[PDB]
């Protein structure tokens, strides 16, 4: 359902530094969350589980690329640090919360690099 549009376009010139931040739905239990780069396959960047903690996708030092933070009304922020953006970092980024009782909630960012 997300491969129709849904997401937000994000333009950048090479060299740019950009933070993407995603936010949990109110009044849900946070079950797990993750960041992915979406091509033909969904390639996970980092995953956070509220008990097991951080887990990275393939060789990463991803603890320097993501951060989770709680705020006021149980809402959680989930952010991805993009640094020194090349055309290779361009593409579709997907933040996927799995919540209870509402299930999956996803936010798509299209990073466009000139």
């Amino acid at each position: 359902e997300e491969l129709f549009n849904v997401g937000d376009d994000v333009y950048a010139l090479p060299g740019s530094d950009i933070n993407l931040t995603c936010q949990t739905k109110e009044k849900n239990f946070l079950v797990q969350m993750q960041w992915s780069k979406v091509t033909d396959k969904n390639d996970m960047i980092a995953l956070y589980h509220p008990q097991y903690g951080l887990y990275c996708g393939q060789e990463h030092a991803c603890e320097s690329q993501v951060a989770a933070t709680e705020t006021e009304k149980g809402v959680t922020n989930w952010t991805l640090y993009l640094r020194n953006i090349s055309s290779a970092l361009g593409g579709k980024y997907e933040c996927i919360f799995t919540l209870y009782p509402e299930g999956i909630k996803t936010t798509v960012y299209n990073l466009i690099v000139e």
Epitope: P50, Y52, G53, L54, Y55, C56, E63, S64, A67, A68
Partner: antibody, heavy 116, light 107 residues
Framework: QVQLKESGPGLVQPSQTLSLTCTVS????????VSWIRQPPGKGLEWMGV???????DYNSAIKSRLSITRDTSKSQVFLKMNSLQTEDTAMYFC??????????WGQGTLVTVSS | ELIQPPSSSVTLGSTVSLTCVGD??????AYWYQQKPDQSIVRVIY???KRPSGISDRFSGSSSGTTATLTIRDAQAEDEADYYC???????????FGGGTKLTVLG
């Protein structure tokens, strides 16, 4: 770069309690776990216990009765406290973290000698 | 619980496979650690067969049923170490280490 550094007294007397501290840098302690692993001299690694990303804990059932793990998120430190020590507790003590259960980062370890 | 042979040999340039056998390994991933004499610990294989950045491509891994194996190719002297496998046990999914295999490189 992340670094885990264990610190401790080096020498503790039998029937005293052993207080170790793991200082985490480059990892957000509130988003990560920290395990304590021990290695008696010449022996293999034995997992001792974990404080989960949410402040809960679990321990190896063979030492659970004397073991206690806590944390101070603001100081970014995790504490191991183990009471009523015998000579067999003489070991190298490591903390490790992230990619549970396949801990990706390890401290160097501190040696603890239990002796009168 | 996690069964590893306490020692093994290879001669320079040849291949060893080190094994780790456990009941739940068909349902749990295995991780492999190399511990050098100064006692520092390095993760060389994760999730049965994935290799982390910065580890020599002579290291690889594979799993079938209840034995996970770690495979060192073109053995170098600096592969002399203790290798430990790590996995998860019981309903509470807690970690366990095998007993460790001491690997000596001959020649």
């Amino acid at each position: 770069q992340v670094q885990l550094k264990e610190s401790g007294p080096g020498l503790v007397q039998p029937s005293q309690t052993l207080s170790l501290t793991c200082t985490v840098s480059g990892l957000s302690l509130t988003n990560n776990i920290v395990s304590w692993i021990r290695q008696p001299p010449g022996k293999g690694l034995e997992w001792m216990g974990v404080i989960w990303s949410n402040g809960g804990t679990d321990y190896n059932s063979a030492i659970k009765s004397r073991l206690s793990i806590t944390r101070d998120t603001s100081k970014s430190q995790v504490f191991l406290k183990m009471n009523s020590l015998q000579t067999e507790d003489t070991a190298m003590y490591f903390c490790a973290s992230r990619d549970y259960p396949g801990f990706a980062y390890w401290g160097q370890g501190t040696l603890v000698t239990v002796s009168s | 619980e996690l069964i590893q042979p306490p020692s093994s040999s290879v001669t320079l340039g040849s291949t060893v496979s080190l094994t780790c056998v456990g009941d739940e390994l068909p349902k749990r991933y295995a991780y492999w650690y190399q511990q050098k004499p100064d006692q520092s610990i390095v993760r060389v294989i994760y999730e049965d067969s994935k290799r982390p950045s910065g580890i020599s491509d002579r290291f690889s891994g594979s799993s079938s049923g209840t034995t996970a194996t770690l495979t060192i190719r073109d053995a170098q002297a600096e592969d002399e170490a203790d290798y430990y496998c790590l996995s998860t046990y019981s309903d509470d999914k807690l970690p366990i280490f095998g007993g460790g295999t001491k690997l000596t490189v001959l020649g």
